[PDB]
Each structure stands twice: as structure tokens, then as C-alpha cells.
Symmetry: D2
Subunit: 294 residues, 4 copies
Amino acid sequence: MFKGSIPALITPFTDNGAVDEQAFAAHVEWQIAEGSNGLVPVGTTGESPTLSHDEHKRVVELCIEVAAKRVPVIAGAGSNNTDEAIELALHAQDAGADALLVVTPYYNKPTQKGLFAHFSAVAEAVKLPIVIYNIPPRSVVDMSPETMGALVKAHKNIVGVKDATGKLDRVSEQRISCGKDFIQLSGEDSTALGFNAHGGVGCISVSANVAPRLCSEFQAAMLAGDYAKALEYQDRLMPLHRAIFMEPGVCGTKYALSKTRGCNRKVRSPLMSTLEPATEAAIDAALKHAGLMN
Amino acid sequence: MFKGSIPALITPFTDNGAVDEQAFAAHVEWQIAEGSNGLVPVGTTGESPTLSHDEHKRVVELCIEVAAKRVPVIAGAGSNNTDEAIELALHAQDAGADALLVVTPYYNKPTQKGLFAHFSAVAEAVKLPIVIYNIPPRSVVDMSPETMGALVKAHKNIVGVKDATGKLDRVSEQRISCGKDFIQLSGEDSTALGFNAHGGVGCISVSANVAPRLCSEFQAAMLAGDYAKALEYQDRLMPLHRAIFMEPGVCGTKYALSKTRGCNRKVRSPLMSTLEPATEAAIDAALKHAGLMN
Amino acid sequence: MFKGSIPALITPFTDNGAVDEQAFAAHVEWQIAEGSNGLVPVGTTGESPTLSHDEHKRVVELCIEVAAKRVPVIAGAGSNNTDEAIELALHAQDAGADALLVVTPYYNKPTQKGLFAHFSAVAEAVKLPIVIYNIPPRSVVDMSPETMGALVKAHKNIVGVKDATGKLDRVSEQRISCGKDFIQLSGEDSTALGFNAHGGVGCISVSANVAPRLCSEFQAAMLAGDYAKALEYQDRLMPLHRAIFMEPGVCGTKYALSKTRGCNRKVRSPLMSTLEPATEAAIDAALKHAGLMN
Amino acid sequence: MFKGSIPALITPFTDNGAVDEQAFAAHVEWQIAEGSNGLVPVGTTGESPTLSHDEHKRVVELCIEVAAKRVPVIAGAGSNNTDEAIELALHAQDAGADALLVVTPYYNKPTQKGLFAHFSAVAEAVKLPIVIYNIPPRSVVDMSPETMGALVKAHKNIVGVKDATGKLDRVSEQRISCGKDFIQLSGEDSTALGFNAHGGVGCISVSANVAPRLCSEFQAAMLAGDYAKALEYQDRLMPLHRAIFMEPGVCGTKYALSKTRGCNRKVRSPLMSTLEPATEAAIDAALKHAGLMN
Ligand SMILES: N[C@@H](CCCC[NH3+])C(=O)O
Ligand SMILES: N[C@@H](CCCC[NH3+])C(=O)O
Ligand SMILES: N[C@@H](CCCC[NH3+])C(=O)O
Ligand SMILES: N[C@@H](CCCC[NH3+])C(=O)O
């Protein structure tokens, strides 16, 4: 599949900061019931940076168990250390994941050849399909369409991109360098609309955590070529997309879910369990606009 | 009225550097015959910065004359000096322009309140509709959706935006702040596709100078809601969009037209009448890919 | 000379926006009396963008007349249009200027070869020494040390740079490409200290408009190699440097001068004659800290 | 205590990728013998991202052992996860470190309040002095002078900053918000000169790995107030500063040391053990210019 609305799942915690397994399972079940087309456990939105390797692996395991092969599980296996990425990738494969989401190394700022070496090493270590997570706003480095194309040519299991550049011309450039069959998924909720118009086939989504049905219907409209209907969904959802990201998306999302479903707001430091009053007011207004709150 | 494929017309020069009125008229005639839905004389692509006031005014006059009310003429009237913008706007109005394209002040970096004051002064001085030209990559400053919305509320003749931010979420934000009836036109050829998906109704276009029929058909497909067909045009045109802008777009465009139509490559310093061999090779390949050269 | 504290002079206006010749003359006389080492009429801070060519030329003329050859007059002759730069440069030369300040073309975004052609054309048109004004925060383009070095090699009258990159390693790179004898002047008040440590010999200064004596003494300390004393001046002046630029520097400066010397706050649109309360409070506090107000 | 030339030590590896304890010890001995005034084990340059926790802790231990209290050891204890930072900080304290270098969280992009919470939690967990490592080019987020000042007020053991903003006005702003006694150390080799002119008292240095004596003498000149001599060292060292960073600094440094001292170029993926020919040529030329190679 690798298409449609694919939530980058939050990782719920109890007040003491421990992983809340029952809350996570309930979230996954609800996501599937509401029409989410795939699942990304332990991406950015799943607070990958503040989980231990054991916790990361466990959340991936739990997601696979709960999904029960109903929709593809694209497991977060990203690291700025190639050894760690391989370790996480191998666990996810053994646990029964359907694909891997692998971020460009952050902080250490490798060259394009370093990016090639990193992704090549992961691709050679596993048999699973790999989705490249290109996110310059977080990793600073930016995998060029040329480097991406080289990886596609070299490795049959490098199958797609979660493109969080926010530059929609990159979709067009990636079509040229990687082919029309290369799976392009939006890494940004607010531009998922234009992204699919350029050739994208879905979105790995933060907002889908809050509004899985509306997000799935939005993606279904674009698959059907009904962009007029898709724009109606954008009118309905854009205030939420924006409000969730006024402060870190993880925190915006957990606040939104605390209002709609009574989810816990707890996150791990340096993320904060609190938000500014204006952010909360904007999220409240966006939820009302979307019809998720009265 | 203001929609579809709207070329930001080049201003052809003769070898002494003077405006070539014959070549300009022929270009306008050909643009209309090939399906262009409107005309922007003396925008960025028309080398507004290197024309005198007299020359600027004359090119606007000539465009109006040649158009003969067949398509709307949205006259370039931008300046970083409010006095000059008013002077150019008043001339264009007297000459018979249908609208004005007014850029955000460049170099002097005004505040949001300065932007408001600038556009308010222009709007109060004329009766014509005004399209705000928001281009942070050139002007550095960026008119916020809030400032844009305030201008829309304050002035009935502020009717649209040529949005060259390259941030397609801005279209969605401008829909919220300015309304669904606010006329949004892409200021970037390469993302015109996603731009319309977000609610845009056309593109003020550099590439239309070279491929007016293909660009018009591309825009027509999106107006009809046929985004699958629009993507086919993007496949055909993207190499050209990219190649024209490897070096300044004015120079890329004039090279392309020198190959297809024998147009003079002459531009005014600090723009160059020459390009790098790799740029010319890429433009050549793009023209062949688009079916404009054999 | 071309060294020490060189104010980029404000252009005072009367309430109706006309150039106030008597106020300008008084400002220049006071600057010289307080120890300013040179003068830049009609730079950015002189509101070059909103003066007509006639007004630009007149202010340059007046500055030359008032200075009476006591300190060098480095006349603003910048334009994004090579023809206009030459026109302004030739007038300044005829009027008796000692040098020219020539900005990198803004808005139209030329290539490095375009920058070379622009500065070469100006250099060949005049006999006067030229100071390149490299300001990427306004012009977007950035003259590389390689391009700068090429201009120095090609033209004996390209003698220096007003470097507003804010990247002090550029001073070191420019020493390599242009030589140790190349005159480097800071284009940023807040980093004039580190700039001279790297090999700079002065600053073309906004803050010198407000505190010419303190700025001259600051520069004199660095010339003497007394960087400990220079740091004491930085402690005294930094709050003013910062406060003046919270909003556009022209407006911050004119407010500061309205408080200390009763100068008119009038500027030309899109600059504003007003500031936010917090900006005015910060400038007030900075003036008190510097000892310019009680 | 914390001043002068402080190398951010490389971590040498053997060909199997393991930490080379013999080579690391020899490097530390040589650094101290050549005049380095302090040591930072397992910073960015020490490849902190690609070490395991056990390896990170071991390299810190070894550095402390070899130093034998001759110069202060400022142990790398940075993480984007507050729990990990605390774990690493507590180990370093128990091992006998003199201070901690703690980076702003990377990738997860916390708010200013998140930064405050992160550094507060680390400061409360240990008794050791903490140097904040502010590096927007890697972490994206940027600790403001206001947030830094708040941390200084709240915690007596937050004593300094490794400032890698490359904005030298920040030193002046940090003097205001944090006080004149706040220990400011340059996080950039190429602007260490201007940094100290603004009030810095040293540099945590990549280049010191290659040229420890020249870097120590450079810093000694600035401490003595001899900025003319310091500039002479900048003339000698600038080509090396630049060449080391054409590609990742770790790799530039290890190449330089392979030429001068026979050090292994081995790094951990996604860093590469190879460089472009032009980079190696530039490093070669820089070493010859500095008198480190014939
Ligand atoms: N905090 C580290 C380790 C996380 C390990 C589990 N995902 C990082 O962001 O890379
Ligand atoms: N070169 C000036 C004047 C151009 C006047 C005609 N458009 C500018 O770019 O603002
Ligand atoms: N406003 C135009 C013309 C100014 C002419 C006098 N300096 C510009 O900024 O280029
Ligand atoms: N690769 C992870 C863990 C490194 C742990 C040792 N410093 C990171 O960069 O945060």
C-alpha cells in the first residue's frame, strides 16, 4: 500500500513519564477504525528522541501486535548514528514491521556521500522496504534529488520518501530523479494537498492523530482525483494543522487529544506538558471549526 | 477576470539597449494568439528595475495598445518608494490598464505597518484593482496573512496576490485572512500546480513567455478540475521551469526565445546577455522535452 | 583616509517630507565638530531609496559644500541599475566627492559575473575610489571574496568594502583575496569591535548619527590597539546599537535624535515616522545608559 | 580556570571502528605539552553522536585519567533527551570532570521554556559547573540571551557558554543578560579573534587538534591584549580554519592529523573516512602555510 493517511503516532505516557501501553493500543485501534491507511510508530511525533532503545523497540512491537496486519506498519528506525539505525531496523524487521521510516542524520551534518553511505548501509542490512525521511528543518542537511535517485538506483528496497522539505517543486524533481513509481508521501500536513497534486500518494501525518476520519477522507478525495472536495477538507482542517504547530506538534497534538478524548498531555523533557494560553485557545477554536468539539 | 496563465512579459531590447517596441508588440500578439489569459507588462521579468520611469510608462502604454482589450492588462507599478509606486500606478490607470501589480518594497525593509501604509496609499490614490506582489526572496520582507487581510478589509480595490513565497500553506492562510474570493495567483511557475490545488486561480508566469500554449492548457486543466491532466503538463514543463531559473529567469527566458523565435538575448546590466554552457544545455534539453525544439 | 568613524548620514525632512537643507548642514557641521572621520551622504540611512535623483544629487552636493574638504566625503552612488549608479557616480565626482559608496544591486538578483560587470562598469566610468557596499540582508545576493578579489585585481580604483555581511570570518577571507591593504569598513555598528580585530580600519555607521564623539573615540581606541578601552565603549554603546535597530535603523536614529537634539522624526513612506512604545522605551534607556540623556 | 585554547578533542578509532585508547591518550598528552589550556572530550568533534553511552563515558574517564588534573576537563554531556544528559553528566561528575559541556537539544526543537527546563534539570542534578553549548547551525533552536540570563540567575552552576552562533553581537548581548563574569568561549575557530574582542576569554576549538601550540599562542596574545599579534596568528591559521571545514570538521581534522602525525582517518558513519581531492589539497596548502608541513 504505502498510500493515503498514515499517522505518525503519538506515544502516550502516564504522569510519571513511563510508556502507557494500554493508551497506545487504544489509540492504534481507534486510528484503524476511523480509516487510517497505515501506521508510523516512533517517528518524530512518537517522541523517538526521548525513548530508550528498549522503549523504542517495545512501542514498535506493540504497534505491530495491535495492527494485526490490517494496515502496513512503517516502523520508525531513524538515527543520526548508522549503527543505531541498523539496530532499530533489524529489530523492527524481526518483530514483523512492513516497512521502515529512516530519517536523515541530524546534528552531525554529513555530506551527500555520507547520506548515501548511511542509507546504503541500512538498505543492505534489511530486506524490508525503506522510506527516506527528508526533513531539513530538523536535520539541517537536505538529501538532494540526485542523491535520492542514486539510492533508488542502487537499492531495490529504497521505495519512497516522507518529504518534509515544504518545497513542492521537490516532488516534481524527485519524479524526474527517482521515477513516477517512487512513493512520495508528504511530511507536512498543511501542504499535503498540493503535495499530492504534484504526484504524492499520501501523507505521514501529525494531524491524523487528532482527526483520523477527516484526514482519511481528505486523502481518499485526492486519490479519486476530486481536488474540489479535497479543498473543502483543507478549509475544514487547516486551522487545526496550523494550531497544532504553533508550539511543538507533539505538544499541540496531545493537548488536542486531551480535549477530544481525554488523553494525557505528558511528554518527555525537553518537550513541555504545557502550552501558552493563546496556543490552547487556537487549538480549541480549530477543533470547533473542524467539528471535533462543540 | 484575473485568472489562468498570465505571462510576466519580457521587455525585448535592441543592441543599443533601447526598448524594442516592434519585438514587444509581436511578443504580446503571439502570447494572446497562443492562449495567454492576461498580461503583466514591466514586472520583474520585464526588467522593471533597469527601465527609466519614461520607459516603464511607455512599455505599459504599448502593452495596453497591442492587447486591444482582448485580455486584462495588469500593469507593473511596483517600487520601494511609495511616491514612485503612486506615480506609476496613476500613469497606468490613465493609459487604460485593467489592474495594477504592486510589489512589496525591496531593499529598505519596512515594517508590517510600513507595508500597510504603502499599499493603503497606493490603493487610495487609484480606482483600479490592485494585486499585491509578495516576494520575500527578492524584497526580504514578507507581508503576513494578517497584514494582507487588514488591507483587504480596508480597501475594496485590493483584490488579489501574486504569491511568490513558495510556501503553499500561505494560500490556505490567505484564504482564511482574506476570504475565498480573494484572487490568488502563483508567483512561482514550478509550484503553480500545487498553488491552484490550495485555491489559486492562475499564475503570473515567467515560463509562459516561452511556452504560452502549453502553460494556458495546463491552467485550463486545473480550472476544469482535471489535476491528472495538469500533472501530465507538469511532467512536460518542469524541466523548462527549472532550467530557466538556473541563472536569472529573465536571461534563461531570453535564451530560450533566442532558440525558438530568434529573440534578442540583450538585457540591461547587472543582468547578463550570456549564460553558462551548462545552463544553455539544460534549457536546450528542456525545450526538446517540451516539444518546442527538435 | 577612509578609516575610523564614518556616519551614514540621515537626510532630515520637514513635516511635508521635503529635504531640510539647513538641518542637514547643521548635522554635518556637528558630526565634524564631534570627531567623525568621514561622511557618507545618501546611503541606506540617508533614505536613498525614497529620494528622487535630483534630491539625491543635491544632498551629495550639500554634504561636499558643508564638509569643505575637512574629512572625506564618500558619496552614496548605489543602484540596482548600472546606468543609474554611473549617473549618480559621475554627478558626485563632478560635485567634488572624495570617494563613492556603491551597493550590490538589490531586488533583481544578478549572478557573481553580473556583480563583476556592474562594479567594473562603474569603476571604468569614474576616476574616484570606490567602496563596495556588500549587504546580503538587503540585496539578498552576496559578493563572494573571489569576486571581490577579481574586482580589486582588475580595477585600481576599487579600494575597499563596507561589509554588512555580519560574518567576521569574511574579513579574514577578504584579507586573503583582496590583500591586507584593501580597506575594510564595518557595515554593522554592533560588530564594529570584532570587525576591526579581524583587520577592519573603521565603520560606516548608523549609530554615529546619534553619538559621534563616543563612536569616534571608540574607533580611535581600536586604532591605538587599545581593545580593552574599545570594549568599555562597546559596554556603553551596545544598548543603543541594538535599540536603534529594533525597527528600521533610520527611524530608530531619528527618534534618538529627536530626544537628544530635537531633530524631526519625519521619514518617507514605506518607512514610518512612528515607532512602537517598547522601541521608544528601549532607545530612551539606551540613551541614558550612554550618558546622552539624563 | 576555563579560558584560552581548549580543544574539542577528536576520538581516534582503530580500523574495526572501536575507540583507540592508546591514540586518544597520546593526543591528550601532546595537546597539554603543546600548551592547550583545557580539554573537551566527547564534544561534537569527538563524535559524540556515534558513540554508545558506555563508549562516551569511557572516553570521558580516559581523558580525566590522562589529564591528571594538569588542565580542566570540560566533559561533553550533551543530549537532546534530558534523561540522557543527566545520565552522562552524573557519570562525568563521578569520574572527576571539572565541568560539563551541555548542548542545546537537537532534532526535537524545544521552545525557549523547554530549553530552560532542560538546562535547569541538568543543573539541579549535578554540582559541577556547566557550559551551555549554543549551536543553531546544528540544533536549529537558538537559546536567546534572555533565556540564558534566566538560567544564570536561577542556577549558580551555569557559568558559561560555548557560543557557536557566529553572531558576535551575541557576546555583547550575553554580557548584558548574563553579566561580565559569565564565561564566554568561542564555538567557532574562524571568529575566535573577534569573539574575544567582544569579551570572550577563549575558544573551544576544532583547529587546536591540529595546531595546539599556535592556537595556544594566539589565545595568549589576546589575553595579553596584543590584538596586533593575534591578527598575525589569524593570518597564519585562517587557511587551516577554513580548509578543515570545507567538509565536516571531524574529517578535515583527522585528515590533517594523518599528514602531520600519522593519525587514523577512521570515523563512524554517517561521517566518511574520505574527502574530496580539492579539500585534501586545501588542507595540505593550509598546513604548509601554517608551517606544520614542508
Ligand atoms: N536521544 C537519542 C537516542 C534515541 C534512541 C531511541 N530512538 C537520539 O535522538 O538520537
Ligand atoms: N532602479 C530603480 C528605479 C526603476 C524605475 C522604473 N521601474 C528601482 O528598481 O526601483
Ligand atoms: N527608489 C529607487 C530609485 C532611487 C533613486 C535615488 N537614490 C531605488 O531604490 O533604486
Ligand atoms: N546517537 C544519539 C546517542 C548518542 C549517545 C552518546 N553520546 C545522539 O546523537 O543523541
